[PDB]
Design a protein around this nucleic acid. Structure first.
Lengths: 92, 93, 77, 91, 89, 104, 79, 98
DNA sequence: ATCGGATGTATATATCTGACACGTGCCTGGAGACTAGGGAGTAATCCCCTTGGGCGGTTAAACGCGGGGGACAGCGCGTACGTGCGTTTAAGCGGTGCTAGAGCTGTCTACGACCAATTGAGCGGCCTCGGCAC
DNA sequence: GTGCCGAGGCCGCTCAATTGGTCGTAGACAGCTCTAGCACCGCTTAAACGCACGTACGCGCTGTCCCCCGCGTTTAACCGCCCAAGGGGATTACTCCCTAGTCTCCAGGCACGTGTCAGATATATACATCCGAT
């Protein structure tokens, strides 16, 4: 009835720190952070597609939404990882 | 689907969210993949710092205070979360 | 007179968590006035967000939206 | 005069708990909504969210009110410092 | 652009004052900025309630949220007067 | 073929506002009173700013509004200075302000 | 190059006078020269991103106005 | 010789520059500056001539706003002269970089 | 004190642009009329959740009293910045071009929305048992 | 030492997301044209630059007094434990006003081509103000 990102954050945490666990308040904090970032990137992508005259949101303007929304050294890694996935998604 | 990409996040749910919010008329195929990768990356970089701050306090579970400290130490995250207030995260001494 | 329910020791605790060492005796009529401005800016929007929905109860989500409208984000509810 | 002051500055920056008493704050937020909408009721989590934001606001304002006092070569915060701090932040 | 209409309003309040090209550019920018603020606030208001329509209640709440107090109080009355004249007459 | 504006008694283009509301995709559907309400509000704000600017131009003994007059009208008034709090009108300039402690 | 030095001392004094200042210390100029560069770097880094998204090779005037509106600084008078 | 007392020619300058609306930096050095700055993010760029104007007029409205509150920091500290301390205080409690 | 020099702005003569201001012309494009489907919206029901009636109990707040240490005023010194003057650059008016963009149109192949039939992925709700707080 | 509990596991499941198949229309792209931008040259003059004096403003030192801090006693408030029988809030309902499509005559400002100021600017003229010296 209520869908969240609990499973996926928990799996990522087990992938990073195999032994640390997480309480419920911190779990809510992390869920809210992911929702906030998703909304930011998506709204910027929509508006940036609207500046040009295109009705389609491709991946190459998730690029520039990331480059506008994320600061400096954070974006240069994120962008890279994004490209990684897409390659492994298509040349699969 | 999102096992062919090495991700841990749901590409299908991300695409459902993108098409529900009516951000555009058409959504490409690489867009949910790209967006789902750059979200697990940020989750993985916040969680590692929070776990490191947990280890110093001789604790084995993360709490809101640990996220607060991890966000306020690092420069990039503090610049990104510059106006957010974590509930009962205290302050940086 | 509810405004006075915020007592001098509470204001000193807040200032101590801010890093302040000495506090003049005129601080506690100034803080008590900036707080009421901040708080009635937020309640006015959180009540507008409610009416729209035909509700009679201010929920914790109206308050979060009212705070986000003013540049400050609140995680964890 | 000044000793314990330090201790309080230390301890309160380690804790995470709320510094205003809950019941008077609830009573205040209820009186300052009677002038927007009569016969209104609040969820219990709606009043916990107002207090978390208000206390964070006041702590954030106190710690640049303290930079203004030091800039003027003092250690005592005066109501003149709060006004300088709010003048530049835009409030 | 809204120029034409902007000029009309001027000839209603100051029948003898003119306006230059750059002041008209300013006024155009101001109208385009306000319209987009109000239309986005209405979008959020509709999405927070899960409704697919932006009626004239979303516009009223967007005006109350966006315009400052005394300004919003008069904007609301203007708009409701317009809608009443539209439907009734 | 009477236009929507004449029915609403306005000077702004109700129909063009409705088209701008559709394209830009703010929601699936758009009511019939939304563009009338929005156009009435836009006309009100325009007339407010233009009246203050015209007064400021008469005060400077002119008969043509320029950016300086818009700057003067906006930054003198209270609600308008709150609304346009962080906007830069170009080719305008700041209003006179010399602090009391610098005169002698 | 030293282009920055092309923001001369008289121009900074003119800006301070429009700001209301009566006396300037002699070290203000190298502080202002440094805090202008940061502002320009931020705005230009956003403007060029907007340009490269459009596949254009000319920074235009909305790229700048969009970059400015994104960082809290709305500008009227340029489209 | 007929001299003016220190700070009387400065007050007529404040009145002079607070009535005009002109653009107070030289045009060419500003363009060379912005081209030098943009020369990092992308090389071999072109600037539409109305974009450098928008940049200049966005950049001076920022410095004029910063100076009129580094001058509130100086008066708070019992002075009439501005030093870099005032700029740093003003920029900190604005969060410009904190 | 004023008082009278000596440099400033503030009123009044003009011209002189170079525009704001209305003739035209086609475009699109809003308005009008039908039809379709379904989102409003206002019933009707069960409830969780919102308040007030009242004890205790244990803090925490309010009041008062030394007494010092920090704010504020005054005074002296000297150093760095303002005012004005005589060079020295270099920005800014105009003339030449001139390649390197930005804009529009025409054409086909690939790509994303729509729709049927699966099924394993998420949820909400059962119990432990260690983990940090007592 | 002492409990005594929230995090993690299990789960039955059902509705979400996958595979397959069609269709119609954006993307890409290639070709051309005309703007848009950049760069070199000579001339003028206005602004930047350097310099010298001088002064008045920043900064340090000293004294006084007042108000804020630390501590102890007594009062009163918030947090606590239990309850009312209110309301309010998210539930589901046939039913009908309303939204978008698909299209026909009339609309309804955007362009470009011309003039008449009007606020600019320069010369002239007083009328007002910093300055110094008694």
């Amino acid at each position: 009835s209520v869908e969240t990102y609990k499973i996926y954050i928990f799996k990522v945490l087990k992938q990073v720190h195999p032994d640390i666990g997480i309480s419920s308040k911190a779990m809510g904090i992390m869920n809210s952070f992911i929702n906030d970032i998703f909304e930011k990137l998506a709204s910027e992508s929509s508006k940036l597609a609207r500046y040009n005259k295109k009705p389609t949101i491709t991946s190459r303007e998730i690029q520039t939404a990331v480059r506008l929304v994320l600061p400096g050294e954070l974006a240069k890694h994120a962008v890279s990882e994004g490209t990684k996935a897409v390659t492994k998604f298509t040349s699969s | 689907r999102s096992s062919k990409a090495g991700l841990q996040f749901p590409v299908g749910r991300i695409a459902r969210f993108l098409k529900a919010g009516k951000y555009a008329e058409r959504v490409g195929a690489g867009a949910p993949v790209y967006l789902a990768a750059v979200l697990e990356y940020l989750a993985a970089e916040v969680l590692e710092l929070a776990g490191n701050a947990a280890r110093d306090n001789k604790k084995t579970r993360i709490v809101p205070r640990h996220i607060q400290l991890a966000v306020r130490n690092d420069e990039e995250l503090s610049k990104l979360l510059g106006d957010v207030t974590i509930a009962n995260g205290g302050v940086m001494p | 007179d509810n405004i006075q329910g915020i007592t001098k020791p509470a204001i000193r605790r807040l200032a101590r968590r801010g890093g302040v060492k000495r506090i003049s005796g005129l601080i506690y009529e100034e803080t008590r006035g900036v707080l009421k401005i901040f708080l009635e800016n937020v309640i006015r929007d959180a009540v507008t967000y409610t009416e729209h929905a035909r509700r009679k109860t201010v929920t914790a989500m109206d308050v979060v939206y009212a705070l986000k409208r003013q540049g400050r984000t609140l995680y964890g509810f | 005069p000044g000793t314990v002051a330090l201790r309080e500055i230390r301890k309160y920056q380690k804790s995470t708990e709320l510094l205003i008493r809950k019941l008077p704050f609830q009573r205040l937020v209820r009186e300052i909504a009677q002038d927007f909408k009569t016969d209104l009721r609040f969820q219990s989590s709606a009043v916990a969210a107002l207090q978390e934001a208000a206390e964070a606001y006041l702590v954030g304002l106190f710690e640049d009110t303290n930079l203004c006092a030091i800039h003027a070569k003092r250690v005592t915060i005066m109501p003149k410092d709060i006004q300088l701090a709010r003048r530049i932040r835009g409030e």
